[PDB]
Amino acid sequence: ATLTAKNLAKAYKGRRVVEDVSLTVNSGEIVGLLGPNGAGKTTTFYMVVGIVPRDAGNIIIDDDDISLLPLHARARRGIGYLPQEASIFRRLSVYDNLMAVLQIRDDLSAEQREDRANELMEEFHIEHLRDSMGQSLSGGERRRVEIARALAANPKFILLDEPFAGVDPISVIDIKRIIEHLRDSGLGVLITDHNVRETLAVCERAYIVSQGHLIAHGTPTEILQDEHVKRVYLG
Amino acid sequence: ATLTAKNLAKAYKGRRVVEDVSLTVNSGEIVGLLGPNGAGKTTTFYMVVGIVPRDAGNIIIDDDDISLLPLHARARRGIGYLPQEASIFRRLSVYDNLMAVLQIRDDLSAEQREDRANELMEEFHIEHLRDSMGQSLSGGERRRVEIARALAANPKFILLDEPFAGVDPISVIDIKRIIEHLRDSGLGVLITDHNVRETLAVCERAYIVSQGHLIAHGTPTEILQDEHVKRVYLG
Ligand SMILES: Nc1ncnc2c1ncn2[C@@H]1O[C@H](COP(=O)(O)OP(=O)(O)OP(=O)(O)O)[C@@H](O)[C@H]1O
Ligand SMILES: Nc1ncnc2c1ncn2[C@@H]1O[C@H](COP(=O)(O)OP(=O)(O)OP(=O)(O)O)[C@@H](O)[C@H]1O
Ligand SMILES: [Mg+2]
Ligand SMILES: [Mg+2]
């Protein structure tokens, strides 16, 4: 129901890239995290997901501090994650890519894994790429496959690190509906992207980060005229 | 059990890189596939595992033709695979890398996954790297982690594609001992590597391929005396 990060801090050498960052995502809502290149968004995703150790802070699900849980146990509790950088298996076919994911699924039979594979391919308009290898896909084809992989894991909370990069405008609409639809079924989404228009359109609320600190919080319409935010991020 | 490949063939352009290759491994044996760079060893491995389509040939386990099964279904039937190129997750720690694989394990409870993790890390002498990230490891540390990952999947048959590249001589001896131990437990092994002396030492018999044809077979002593093998491979 509730995923909360409190007082996250991270430094490299001594560059404070995240300091005292707190945020919350509830199931059945889409929440943004936006900000300048290097502001510390991917780093906060790392700390929530469990891939770098934090300098300070706590990760909580439903009044349960899971800060000491390793990555795999946090994923078992429902945290999913789409990396920013490419993560498709380059030698595997699209279908193989999604099946490697659906292997983890103790809630689906062999037949239901099959159908879920086809279903995702049809939803993302990639069924014609079924037997294409990862390495032979175009930039947007590859990204949409990676989004489908991350969804195929059926998380409770999904952190999407720049899902729209390389993605055409029509697929960006299509993906927004896939995500809206899963939100309706209780999926919590934390999303970052620099396609600000399309991202804010689907967000119920959003956080703004800049040089490692939160500098704003609220609706799309609100964020779009916070004076600090126009100066440091929007133009 | 018995894993057989029969009459495998594969061509790219007007270059047939594998032609009429047949191989077999039984549980409880270690078998080599050796031969010049480009001879078609990795290509054969891809056809057995299921990542490249075959031009001709059949894959059989015991009395079952599994040629039509996809990669995930062949792995469920007990085919395992260590890729030649790097496959570690670069942003995960050694421990996370191991746990991500031990997630697929229906036969181990959460406590038993973690004992298997520590057990693997101590057998490969990598426990001091437990929380080091994939990308910051040396070449042989990275390779040893990749072998542990492939064995963590508990296959019935494992195809090891150049496991000793980058690995120091002491760890080579250690790895030979770890796989001889799993051989004694019923694991079948198909191994290819250019450390000829060390690889033939643990093989009971081997095949020599050159330009995609089998040109020799037999014990290590037989392989090493064959004049065809000296000329095209040993030099
Ligand atoms: N291992 C590292 N060592 C030193 N500095 C690092 C390391 N990793 C990241 N940084 C720095 O920390 C800052 C923030 O990294 P981060 O990836 O969190 O940015 P981001 O908010 O995701 O931005 P973008 O919008 O460009 O993706 C960057 O300026 C980056 O160069
Ligand atoms: N996609 C491709 N297109 C064209 N040629 C290819 C392709 N993939 C592999 N080859 C060629 O197939 C031949 C066999 O490759 P393979 O990877 O099977 O060799 P190997 O026996 O594994 O050699 P090494 O001992 O260097 O790993 C090579 O000469 C390679 O150049
Ligand atoms: Mg980033
Ligand atoms: Mg090879």
| Nearest of B98, B88, B93, B86 to residue B133 by alpha carbon | B93
Centre of ligand 3 to C-alpha A10, Å, is: 14
A92 to chain B: nearest residue by CA? B51
A94 to chain B: nearest residue by CA? B51
What is the structure's resolution, reported in angstroms to one decimal? 2.2
Distance CA A200, CA A222 (A): 11
Distance CA B165, CA B140 (A): 8
Distance CA A191, CA A178 (A): 14
Question: Domain segments of chain A: what residues?
Answer: 1-235
Structure tokens at B173: 């001896």
What is the number of the ligand 1 atom nearest to the C-alpha of A36? 25
| Nearest of B65, B63, B57, B67 to residue B23 by alpha carbon | B57
Which candidate in B74, B81, B91 is best for mutational testing of the A interface (most A CBs within 10 A)? B91
Distances (CA, A) of B45 to B79, B80, B116, B191: 11, 11, 27, 10
* Architecture of the structural domain at A1-235: 3-Layer(aba) Sandwich (3.40)
Does any ligand 1 atom lie closer than 6 A to the CB of residue A136? no
**Closest Cα of chain A to B157: distance in Å?**
19
- What one-character-per-residue DSSP string does A93-145 give? BHHHHHHHHHTT-TTS-HHHHHHHHHHHHHHTT-GGGTT-BGGGS-HHHHHHH
Instruction: Write the residue with the smallest CA distance to atom 27 of ligand 1.
Output: A37
Centre of ligand 1 to C-alpha A46, Å, is: 11
In this structure, the strands spanning B15-26 and B2-12 are antiparallel
Please give the single-letter amino acid code of residue B203: C
Distance CA A25, CA A40 (A): 18
Residue B96 in contact with partner chain A when CB distance is under 8 A: yes
CA A230 to chain centre: 24
Distance CA B49, CA B69 (A): 10
Distances (CA, A) of A59 to A34, A79, B63: 20, 11, 52
| Nearest of A175, A154, A48 to residue A101 by alpha carbon | A154
Kind and range of the H or E run holding A4 = strand A2-12
- Which method was used? X-ray
For B231, which DSSP code? I
